[PDB]
Amino acid sequence: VKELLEAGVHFGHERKRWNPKFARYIYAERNGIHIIDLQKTMEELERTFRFIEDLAMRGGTILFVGTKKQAQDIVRMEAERAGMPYVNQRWLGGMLTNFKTISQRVHRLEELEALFASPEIEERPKKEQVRLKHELERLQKYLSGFRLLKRLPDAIFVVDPTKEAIAVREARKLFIPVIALADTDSDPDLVDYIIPGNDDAIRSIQLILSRAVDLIIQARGGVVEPSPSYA
Amino acid sequence: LTDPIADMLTRIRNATRVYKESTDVPASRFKEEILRILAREGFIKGYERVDVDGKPYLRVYLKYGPRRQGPDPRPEQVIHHIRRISKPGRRVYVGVKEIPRVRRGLGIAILSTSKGVLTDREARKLGVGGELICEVW
Amino acid sequence: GRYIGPVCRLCRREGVKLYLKGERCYSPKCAMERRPYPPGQHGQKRARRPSDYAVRLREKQKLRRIYGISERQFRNLFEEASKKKGVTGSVFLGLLESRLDNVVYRLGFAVSRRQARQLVRHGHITVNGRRVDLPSYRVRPGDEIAVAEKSRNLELIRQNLEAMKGRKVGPWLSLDVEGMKGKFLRLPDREDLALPVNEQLVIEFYSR
Amino acid sequence: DFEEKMILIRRTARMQAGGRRFRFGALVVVGDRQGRVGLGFGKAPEVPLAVQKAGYYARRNMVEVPLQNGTIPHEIEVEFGASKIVLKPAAPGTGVIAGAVPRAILELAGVTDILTKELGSRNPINIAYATMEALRQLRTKADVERLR
RNA sequence: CUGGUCCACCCGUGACGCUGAGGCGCGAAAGCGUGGGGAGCAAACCGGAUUAGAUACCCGGGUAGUCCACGCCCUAAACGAUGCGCGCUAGGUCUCUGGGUCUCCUGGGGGCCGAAGCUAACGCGUUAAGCGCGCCGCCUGGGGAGUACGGCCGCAAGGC
RNA sequence: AGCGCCGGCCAACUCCGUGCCAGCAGCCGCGGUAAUACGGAGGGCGCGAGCGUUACCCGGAUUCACUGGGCGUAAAGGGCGUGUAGGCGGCCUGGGGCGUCCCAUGUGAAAGACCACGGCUCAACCGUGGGGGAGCGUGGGAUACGCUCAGGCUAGACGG
């Protein structure tokens, strides 16, 4: 499922803005840029993909977490492929530790999923009506993938654990496996199942994400091949 | 430097709090006889006599507990506490009858005796007292 | 001397029957059946949360008022139990039950500890064959506590031992009715009594 | 189920234009009398909610505290900033020797016999936290040789 | 004319070290003694305003003194309110000054932000207020009072 | 059969009287016309031939901190150097055996204390037995560390 010629997308970056705790996954500092060693990645993917495949094999649920620009749309696709919950735009504080309370915003969502599912009564003030069509969109803008998350997840798969320290901190507090792909600017000790590598190259973000999702399909029966590897 | 022994107890203390794999100690015979105790008792994986920038040192190989769950995954320490007792400013000598038990036996006490460097349990076995070098648990 | 005052207000304050009268304590006339609230003006006012010093003081007055013993002796006997070997709670109880006047009561020669004390102070009780008129005399394993010869022909211990024929005295004790003598076999264990007291709180009281 | 004890209730105050407006703080330990204890601090605008809120958090902050015939396995000292608790194991016939705050914690953990002593700031809250962290660091022979 | 200090080479001595009660020296300003100097400035002081007052702030004047030489005084928010020495415990950024193979690597300083850890908190953090050892100084409720008595010092003020 | 106490600490509360008065008070504090805090009364709590008070010692007081504290801003770094005495001191080999550790032995009176048993009816009181030390004298032994003496080293320190 893995590769060895994945070294043709990323092998690391981020020039001397590093976290010293990451040095045990760094091979050399060449063009001003810290270069990640992938023999450290290959062993680690063996751990992570051992965890991911074994997790879906028993009915798990991985909350995929991506927020930044270079990983915005790709995390939407890959989580929808495996039918997995994603958080796309903003990570709402408490989403995990205050789950039974933010989930109270998807019930309001399903409400406007029924209301604007013709008709209940649309014959109630259009102002009072189009008031809601904006509240509808907003809920979809932030709860589009979290809605399928009906219960506190079994693990989370984040794109950037520094950029997403809030989500990590909550999951760590709930004894939730924190699995993540991370480059030279993050804390290995905070990640339960690590994937050392670039998290800014879309050419690399999609790679370790798209063919990680592929592994999730084969663990819940049957395979599919093509996912969006847009150029 | 004024107390080579307290320096080594402290080099290790500082090394275990940042979870270093190893830490070098300036080499001496009395320090071997103390690291001899620490390894056999499980507190360290052991040591080897090495050479740093031409000078004899002692690479001490440390040890830690399992990775823990929750916030702060950092593992519990195997050496929780390693404390100088007898100091150049105040020597501490106990006869055999007043050798302390460290943490109700779940810890050790290293002493220097005319029969060599022993643990507290080793001292009463040989029936001798000595100079309380340190307590460890 | 000992407390020679009203006795039902004692149980009423402690909130549990302290069988300190004998007959009356098993009739509907027992004042703990009728009014089970503290004596005096404010008994029927609803109680507040007592302090933990109150909880321990109350457990320690209960234990002391059971044996009708002065605080001086009750504390004296506590301190012997304390400095003794190990388990203080058991020893304080055992040394308390070792008192002669108490043993007279447990044997059934008397219906109440107050009466038991008087049976001794008036000489009607002997220990191993000698008049021993001391309420605080320490009975030990082996002794034979009896009724004096010039006493065995007296209404009170005759009637008292009668109803004792119907009673089964504590295991650590022995009783030969009609001979009017008993034996102290061994000082009681912990569970030999179900005294309405948590003696661990009494230790807690004096450790302050 | 578990058993609760209210160590501390107290009234605090904030100010605004108009005068002082009060809050209530509840410091409650909950135990199993057989090795489970928890400590919780619950603050609310009225006394019952806080007393009930603290018992909630308590049930979600428990410690193993491994007894040994009613006593702790080894002597321990913990500082929680200026507050300091000392705990020493003690034989059977001795009792629980502690002030009210650590007593409520040890007695709800099933500790029947121990010697304690508070030092420095005997501030109940910080003493309570320091007592919990002391129990949290209790080790057994099977705990330590497994580590070594 | 003279001190300190850093760096390169790794050439010499072979533990010759660290701290340091006493001692001794240095010690901002102001002040003191004897001469000298005196533009500006300016305690005191005089005047003009302001004000209920205005022994002030504001204005116009102005003597010590501020300056020099020598001899005293020895105080301070004399502060980083942080004693000295040594070893150990992530890094990022800016700067001064050395050395190299001149990306940078490496020393010795000066700042900022921060790991672990410390702290009552504020904050400290390889320039520790972290982890350790040595030695010294010092604290032990506020006011009385840094006063009194005594002693030592000083020309005095006054200092210890 | 009495004495103290019933606002919190701290165990025990109501009515009257008083109205910043009279008074209470170990500390925090009570009394200004509805006082569980003053005075009496009822009731209640604690002890009991006692109960209270004053004085003083130890404790709580890790508040002189050996066990077992501190000094940026809470009280606390000497204004700074230099240096006497003194405290303290790197790596390696050995000689001694001062410290230190061990073994043996002498001393450590009786009484007291503690444990067992017994005599005064119990107890207090008292008899009989048992068990110990530390410290010092002496004899034997150990030599890791501290000490000393001797020899070697170069990592500290100093010099070119």
Ligand code: SF4
């Ligand atoms: S009659 Fe009832 S209330 Fe009175 S002393 Fe006996 S048990 Fe107690």
Ligand SMILES: [Mg+2]
């Ligand atoms: Mg990034």
Ligand SMILES: [Mg+2]
């Ligand atoms: Mg000795």
Ligand SMILES: [Mg+2]
């Ligand atoms: Mg009667």
Ligand SMILES: [Mg+2]
């Ligand atoms: Mg006591």
Ligand SMILES: [Mg+2]
């Ligand atoms: Mg006491």
Ligand SMILES: [Mg+2]
């Ligand atoms: Mg355990």
Ligand SMILES: [Mg+2]
């Ligand atoms: Mg502290």
Ligand SMILES: [Mg+2]
């Ligand atoms: Mg505190």
Ligand SMILES: [Mg+2]
């Ligand atoms: Mg205090």
Ligand SMILES: [Mg+2]
């Ligand atoms: Mg206080």
Ligand SMILES: [Mg+2]
């Ligand atoms: Mg050389």
Ligand SMILES: [Mg+2]
């Ligand atoms: Mg040479």
Ligand SMILES: [Mg+2]
């Ligand atoms: Mg001067």
Ligand SMILES: [Mg+2]
């Ligand atoms: Mg001047």
Ligand SMILES: [Mg+2]
């Ligand atoms: Mg002059």
